[PDB]
Amino acid sequence: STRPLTLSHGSLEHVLLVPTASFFIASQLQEQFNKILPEPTEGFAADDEPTTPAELVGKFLGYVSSLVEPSKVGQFDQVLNLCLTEFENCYLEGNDIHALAAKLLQENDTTLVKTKELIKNYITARIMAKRPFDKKSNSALFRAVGEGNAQLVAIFGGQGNTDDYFEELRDLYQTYHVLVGDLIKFSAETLSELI
Amino acid sequence: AQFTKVIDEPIKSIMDGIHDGHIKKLLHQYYGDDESKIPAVEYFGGESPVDSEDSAVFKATSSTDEESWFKALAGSEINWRHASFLCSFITQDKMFVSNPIRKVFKPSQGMVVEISNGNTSSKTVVTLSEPVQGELKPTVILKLLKENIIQMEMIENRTMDGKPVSLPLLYNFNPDNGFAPISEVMEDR
């Protein structure tokens, strides 16, 4: 048996087929979540306000991930895993998070910053749920260079591309912390020592 | 002005001069001076700058996309059939009318088209069948008669004695005119 759990913010919702077992814990998170969402507006214009059903499930993955412990296994782990599985089925369809993020930009009226939040939430969610990106990717580009219908050269920029270079670092550290945090931390410690 | 010297040169000579010159250079530069290497097509033209099986049946729903439908009835090979279903207009003696084959074969609920001998154009026959008082019957038979005459047989199955009646519409197919290859035989029409 399953049993529904409506995630909602104004007009938009996502019906969540939660197993009978995990419903106790799941509807707790649901309640504590619904209060931390701001008041709905027309168009869902406010910065921290999900414009699509996908963003909504995004914010929930991000919330539930924040209450999950990296060394021990708490009670929220079996819930996170089902929200991921549901998100991956309804919204990714086997494609990458970035491909979805680009749909929402041209197709819907989500902003860049709301999309960078969606990417953050899903990738943070994947690592905290002990589901790393171990599988080799179905990337169409990389398949094609694989078959020799394509070839890549990697180029690396220099100084002078924008006046606000450090914001690109912020964006990496904030968006992709779970992937890049170790590297930033190592780089910082390395440079302190160099000094 | 540096290329304008020979007075009273016929216009055909000037223009063919330029075209023939390009062919000569293209042949040498890319085809090893070999005319046998030049690909061939029954007729050349009618191609928008944007753009099988020998025995098939096609059923028109109310959702069937016109463009897919006509592309299907046309077939991939460029012949009288390709023109009949894709060529937008036909000639009626200097004047250009809407292609009546496309008009009659415009898809809608009930229509069933059967292509026999798809892969040999000389023999190909496309047959439109529609509901006629409950039972489904042939309304249109499209095929070559002689090598350069298309015949669209328009059939009324509701007649004075039950025996079906035929209007043989006849069209010349001239692949020397790629832009407007189909032209209605107007004589005795």
């Binding site: - | 540096q2 304008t4 009273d8 216009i11 330029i18 010159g21 928008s48 944007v50 004047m95």
Partner: protein
């Protein structure tokens, strides 16, 4: 315009309409494309701005064929102040982003030889750009001494005797007779390439 529509609707064999001396607005183009049963529309942009206007017309009817007839100042009759090459070097990439544009090169052409490097696309090599092949060509001046044009016998003789000049010297028409051609203002003040007769 109403004539073409009337005639077109009686099934007259008019294939296309070319608009000369500048490019219509989107609203007016949209009219010509949808009202006049034409199989393509020819536009004769004279400047980089005019080429953009042609692109925006193509953008707006992406399944309708547009013959973009590019033309230099070196052209005969009413002419621009523009180089024949720079505008195409700047815009070629943007033009080819629109499949429905059939890009035709006009002005100064007379033969298979001078015209061929534009068909190949090898012309743009000279300027350290990649090859840029063209879909077609138009010959205005070259054709004016054909047998079946109505140009008077002595007029053909006069046209013929014009030695003409290479592209690198064409702009001297503004000052003096150049290849036996001068430029000269119309009653409205637009420049015109005419043979430097006494008149």
């Amino acid at each position: 315009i109403p004539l073409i529509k009337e005639l077109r609707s009686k099934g007259y064999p008019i294939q296309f309409l070319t608009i000369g001396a500048g490019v219509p607005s989107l609203e007016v183009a949209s009219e010509y494309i949808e009202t006049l049963g034409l199989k393509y529309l020819g536009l004769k942009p004279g400047s980089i701005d005019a080429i953009s206007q042609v692109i925006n017309i193509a953008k707006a009817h992406p399944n309708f064929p547009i013959a973009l007839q590019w033309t230099g100042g070196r052209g005969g009759g009413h002419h621009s102040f523009e180089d024949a090459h720079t505008p195409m070097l700047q815009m070629y990439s943007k033009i080819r982003r629109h499949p429905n544009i059939m890009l035709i090169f006009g002005s100064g052409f007379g033969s298979a030889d001078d015209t061929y490097p534009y068909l190949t696309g090898e012309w743009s090599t000279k300027f350290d750009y990649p090859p840029m092949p063209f879909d077609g060509f138009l010959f205005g001046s070259r054709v004016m001494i054909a047998k079946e044009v109505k140009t008077s016998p002595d007029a053909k003789k006069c046209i013929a005797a014009c030695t003409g000049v290479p592209d690198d010297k064409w702009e001297q028409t503004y000052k003096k007779p150049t290849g036996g051609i001068v430029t000269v203002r119309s009653e409205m003040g637009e420049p015109i390439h005419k043979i430097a007769t006494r008149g």
